[PDB]
Design a protein around this ligand. Structure first.
Ligand SMILES: *[C@@H]1O[C@H](CO)[C@@H](O)[C@H](O)[C@H]1NC(C)=O
Ligand SMILES: [Cu+2]
Length: 235
Protein backbone atom coordinates (compact mmCIF):
# COMPACT_ATOMS: atom_id res chain seq x y z
CA UNK A 1 0.00 0.00 0.00
CA UNK A 2 1.85 3.07 -1.29
CA UNK A 3 1.23 6.38 -3.23
CA UNK A 4 3.33 9.08 -4.97
CA UNK A 5 3.81 12.33 -2.96
CA UNK A 6 5.43 14.21 -5.87
CA UNK A 7 8.60 14.36 -7.97
CA UNK A 8 12.06 15.90 -7.94
CA UNK A 9 13.84 17.21 -11.05
CA UNK A 10 17.68 17.22 -11.01
CA UNK A 11 17.56 16.78 -7.20
CA UNK A 12 15.12 19.68 -6.68
CA UNK A 13 11.73 18.95 -5.01
CA UNK A 14 8.82 20.12 -7.29
CA UNK A 15 6.47 20.21 -4.25
CA UNK A 16 3.38 18.20 -3.18
CA UNK A 17 1.99 16.81 -6.50
CA UNK A 18 -1.10 15.01 -5.14
CA UNK A 19 -4.15 15.81 -7.38
CA UNK A 20 -1.95 18.64 -8.82
CA UNK A 21 0.50 17.04 -11.31
CA UNK A 22 -0.05 13.43 -10.07
CA UNK A 23 -3.38 11.78 -11.16
CA UNK A 24 -3.75 10.57 -7.54
CA UNK A 25 -6.28 7.90 -6.51
CA UNK A 26 -8.08 8.56 -3.20
CA UNK A 27 -6.03 5.95 -1.23
CA UNK A 28 -3.09 3.54 -1.41
CA UNK A 29 -5.18 0.40 -2.24
CA UNK A 30 -3.67 -1.81 -4.97
CA UNK A 31 -5.12 -2.44 -8.45
CA UNK A 32 -5.34 -6.24 -9.16
CA UNK A 33 -7.66 -6.60 -12.19
CA UNK A 34 -5.29 -6.92 -15.20
CA UNK A 35 -8.20 -6.18 -17.63
CA UNK A 36 -9.51 -3.05 -15.78
CA UNK A 37 -9.09 0.51 -17.14
CA UNK A 38 -7.69 1.13 -13.59
CA UNK A 39 -4.44 -0.51 -14.92
CA UNK A 40 -3.75 2.64 -17.02
CA UNK A 41 -3.40 5.36 -14.30
CA UNK A 42 -5.25 3.88 -11.24
CA UNK A 43 -8.89 4.47 -10.20
CA UNK A 44 -9.15 8.31 -10.69
CA UNK A 45 -7.60 8.91 -14.12
CA UNK A 46 -8.41 12.55 -15.10
CA UNK A 47 -6.46 15.63 -16.15
CA UNK A 48 -5.02 17.43 -13.10
CA UNK A 49 -4.20 21.12 -13.38
CA UNK A 50 -0.35 21.19 -13.48
CA UNK A 51 2.34 19.43 -15.54
CA UNK A 52 6.00 19.41 -14.33
CA UNK A 53 8.44 21.05 -16.82
CA UNK A 54 11.62 19.05 -17.62
CA UNK A 55 14.23 18.92 -20.44
CA UNK A 56 15.78 15.81 -22.08
CA UNK A 57 18.71 14.53 -19.90
CA UNK A 58 17.02 15.71 -16.65
CA UNK A 59 16.69 13.30 -13.70
CA UNK A 60 12.95 12.81 -12.85
CA UNK A 61 12.55 11.31 -9.35
CA UNK A 62 9.25 9.73 -8.14
CA UNK A 63 8.76 9.90 -4.35
CA UNK A 64 6.44 7.26 -2.79
CA UNK A 65 5.05 7.11 0.79
CA UNK A 66 2.69 4.84 2.79
CA UNK A 67 0.59 7.05 5.15
CA UNK A 68 2.77 10.19 5.63
CA UNK A 69 5.70 11.56 3.57
CA UNK A 70 9.06 9.79 4.19
CA UNK A 71 7.53 7.09 6.49
CA UNK A 72 8.10 3.29 6.06
CA UNK A 73 7.15 3.89 2.30
CA UNK A 74 5.58 0.41 1.64
CA UNK A 75 5.26 -2.71 3.88
CA UNK A 76 8.51 -4.83 3.75
CA UNK A 77 6.24 -7.83 2.86
CA UNK A 78 5.53 -6.29 -0.63
CA UNK A 79 8.69 -7.75 -2.37
CA UNK A 80 8.55 -7.09 -6.13
CA UNK A 81 9.80 -5.20 -9.19
CA UNK A 82 9.52 -1.51 -10.25
CA UNK A 83 9.05 -0.16 -13.80
CA UNK A 84 8.49 3.30 -15.33
CA UNK A 85 6.65 3.82 -18.63
CA UNK A 86 6.02 6.93 -20.81
CA UNK A 87 3.22 7.80 -23.24
CA UNK A 88 2.20 11.05 -24.98
CA UNK A 89 -0.51 12.93 -23.02
CA UNK A 90 -2.78 13.06 -26.18
CA UNK A 91 -3.38 9.22 -25.76
CA UNK A 92 -4.76 9.62 -22.18
CA UNK A 93 -2.90 6.24 -21.80
CA UNK A 94 -5.24 4.48 -24.30
CA UNK A 95 -3.92 2.21 -27.12
CA UNK A 96 -0.42 0.76 -27.77
CA UNK A 97 1.38 3.85 -26.32
CA UNK A 98 3.35 2.83 -23.15
CA UNK A 99 7.17 2.68 -23.64
CA UNK A 100 9.30 1.22 -20.84
CA UNK A 101 12.05 3.57 -19.55
CA UNK A 102 13.09 1.53 -16.48
CA UNK A 103 13.04 -2.02 -15.04
CA UNK A 104 14.39 -3.28 -11.71
CA UNK A 105 13.31 -6.69 -10.24
CA UNK A 106 15.92 -8.57 -8.12
CA UNK A 107 19.61 -7.57 -7.42
CA UNK A 108 21.59 -10.84 -6.90
CA UNK A 109 24.65 -9.05 -5.36
CA UNK A 110 22.73 -7.26 -2.51
CA UNK A 111 20.01 -10.02 -2.50
CA UNK A 112 17.29 -7.30 -2.60
CA UNK A 113 14.09 -6.72 -4.55
CA UNK A 114 13.43 -3.28 -6.16
CA UNK A 115 10.82 -2.64 -3.36
CA UNK A 116 13.38 -3.46 -0.64
CA UNK A 117 15.74 -0.82 -2.15
CA UNK A 118 12.84 1.68 -2.62
CA UNK A 119 12.27 1.64 1.21
CA UNK A 120 16.08 2.22 1.80
CA UNK A 121 15.86 5.14 -0.76
CA UNK A 122 13.02 6.86 1.28
CA UNK A 123 10.56 6.11 -1.60
CA UNK A 124 12.74 7.67 -4.37
CA UNK A 125 13.46 6.16 -7.81
CA UNK A 126 14.44 8.03 -10.99
CA UNK A 127 14.54 8.03 -14.81
CA UNK A 128 16.55 10.29 -17.12
CA UNK A 129 14.14 12.17 -19.44
CA UNK A 130 14.64 10.84 -22.99
CA UNK A 131 15.25 12.79 -26.27
CA UNK A 132 11.59 12.47 -27.41
CA UNK A 133 9.48 15.17 -29.12
CA UNK A 134 8.84 18.24 -26.96
CA UNK A 135 5.27 18.20 -25.53
CA UNK A 136 3.05 16.77 -22.81
CA UNK A 137 3.56 13.26 -21.42
CA UNK A 138 2.35 10.77 -18.81
CA UNK A 139 5.06 8.98 -16.79
CA UNK A 140 3.50 5.79 -15.30
CA UNK A 141 5.41 4.44 -12.25
CA UNK A 142 4.43 0.83 -11.39
CA UNK A 143 5.31 -1.20 -8.30
CA UNK A 144 4.25 -4.90 -8.37
CA UNK A 145 3.98 -6.43 -4.87
CA UNK A 146 4.22 -10.29 -5.24
CA UNK A 147 3.42 -11.45 -1.64
CA UNK A 148 0.03 -12.89 -2.89
CA UNK A 149 1.06 -13.49 -6.58
CA UNK A 150 1.12 -17.33 -6.20
CA UNK A 151 -2.62 -16.92 -7.10
CA UNK A 152 -4.16 -15.17 -10.12
CA UNK A 153 -6.74 -12.40 -9.33
CA UNK A 154 -8.75 -13.66 -12.35
CA UNK A 155 -9.11 -17.04 -10.52
CA UNK A 156 -9.18 -15.84 -6.87
CA UNK A 157 -10.04 -12.15 -6.42
CA UNK A 158 -8.89 -12.06 -2.78
CA UNK A 159 -5.26 -12.76 -3.93
CA UNK A 160 -3.00 -11.93 -6.94
CA UNK A 161 -0.18 -9.59 -7.89
CA UNK A 162 -0.77 -6.08 -6.50
CA UNK A 163 -0.17 -3.01 -8.74
CA UNK A 164 0.69 0.39 -7.26
CA UNK A 165 0.33 2.63 -10.35
CA UNK A 166 0.86 6.40 -10.48
CA UNK A 167 0.71 8.72 -13.51
CA UNK A 168 2.68 12.05 -13.39
CA UNK A 169 1.91 14.83 -15.92
CA UNK A 170 5.37 15.86 -17.28
CA UNK A 171 5.98 18.57 -19.98
CA UNK A 172 9.24 18.05 -21.95
CA UNK A 173 10.33 21.55 -23.14
CA UNK A 174 13.96 21.33 -24.45
CA UNK A 175 14.57 18.18 -26.56
CA UNK A 176 16.19 17.69 -30.02
CA UNK A 177 13.68 14.77 -30.59
CA UNK A 178 16.66 12.63 -31.71
CA UNK A 179 15.10 9.42 -30.14
CA UNK A 180 11.47 9.77 -31.26
CA UNK A 181 9.18 7.60 -29.09
CA UNK A 182 8.65 4.13 -30.68
CA UNK A 183 5.42 2.03 -30.52
CA UNK A 184 3.95 1.37 -27.02
CA UNK A 185 2.10 -1.46 -25.14
CA UNK A 186 -1.48 -1.02 -23.85
CA UNK A 187 -2.45 -0.90 -20.15
CA UNK A 188 -4.70 -2.65 -19.61
CA UNK A 189 -3.57 -5.42 -22.01
CA UNK A 190 0.25 -5.92 -21.87
CA UNK A 191 -0.09 -8.01 -18.64
CA UNK A 192 -2.17 -11.26 -18.86
CA UNK A 193 -2.39 -14.32 -16.53
CA UNK A 194 0.34 -16.14 -18.64
CA UNK A 195 2.73 -13.15 -18.67
CA UNK A 196 6.12 -13.96 -17.03
CA UNK A 197 6.36 -12.28 -13.55
CA UNK A 198 2.55 -11.93 -12.92
CA UNK A 199 2.10 -15.35 -11.19
CA UNK A 200 5.17 -16.16 -9.05
CA UNK A 201 5.82 -17.82 -5.68
CA UNK A 202 8.41 -15.69 -3.82
CA UNK A 203 8.32 -18.22 -0.87
CA UNK A 204 9.47 -21.33 -2.92
CA UNK A 205 11.03 -19.99 -6.21
CA UNK A 206 14.54 -18.44 -5.96
CA UNK A 207 14.32 -14.64 -6.52
CA UNK A 208 17.22 -15.16 -9.03
CA UNK A 209 14.72 -17.10 -11.29
CA UNK A 210 12.17 -14.20 -11.21
CA UNK A 211 11.57 -12.69 -14.68
CA UNK A 212 9.71 -9.30 -14.70
CA UNK A 213 6.76 -8.75 -17.10
CA UNK A 214 7.74 -7.58 -20.60
CA UNK A 215 8.04 -5.30 -22.48
CA UNK A 216 11.83 -4.85 -22.36
CA UNK A 217 13.31 -1.39 -21.62
CA UNK A 218 13.47 0.81 -24.78
CA UNK A 219 17.03 1.19 -26.26
CA UNK A 220 16.27 5.00 -26.28
CA UNK A 221 15.99 5.04 -22.43
CA UNK A 222 18.69 6.66 -20.15
CA UNK A 223 17.16 5.84 -16.74
CA UNK A 224 17.76 5.41 -14.04
CA UNK A 225 17.99 4.13 -10.51
CA UNK A 226 16.39 3.41 -7.10
CA UNK A 227 18.27 5.79 -4.74
CA UNK A 228 17.49 8.79 -2.52
CA UNK A 229 18.32 12.09 -4.41
CA UNK A 230 16.84 14.51 -1.84
CA UNK A 231 16.12 14.80 1.89
CA UNK A 232 12.37 15.50 2.41
CA UNK A 233 13.02 15.96 6.20
CA UNK A 234 15.04 19.22 5.47
CA UNK A 235 11.88 21.10 4.30
C1 LIG B 1 -12.15 -6.82 -14.09
O1 LIG B 1 -12.26 -5.78 -15.08
C2 LIG B 1 -13.07 -6.09 -16.20
C3 LIG B 1 -12.95 -5.00 -17.27
O2 LIG B 1 -13.40 -3.74 -16.73
C4 LIG B 1 -14.47 -6.20 -15.61
O3 LIG B 1 -15.36 -6.53 -16.65
C5 LIG B 1 -14.53 -7.32 -14.59
O4 LIG B 1 -15.84 -7.40 -14.03
C6 LIG B 1 -13.54 -7.03 -13.46
N1 LIG B 1 -13.49 -8.06 -12.40
C7 LIG B 1 -13.98 -7.84 -11.16
C8 LIG B 1 -13.93 -9.02 -10.27
O5 LIG B 1 -14.47 -6.76 -10.77
CU1 LIG C 1 -0.21 -3.15 0.50
Amino acid sequence: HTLVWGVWVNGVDQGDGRNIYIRSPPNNNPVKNLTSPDMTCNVDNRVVPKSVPVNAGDTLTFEWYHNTRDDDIIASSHHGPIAVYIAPAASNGQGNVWVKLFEDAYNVTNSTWAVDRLITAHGQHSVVVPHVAPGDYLFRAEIIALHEADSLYSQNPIRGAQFYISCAQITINSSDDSTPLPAGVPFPGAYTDSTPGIQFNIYTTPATSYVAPPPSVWSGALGGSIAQVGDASLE
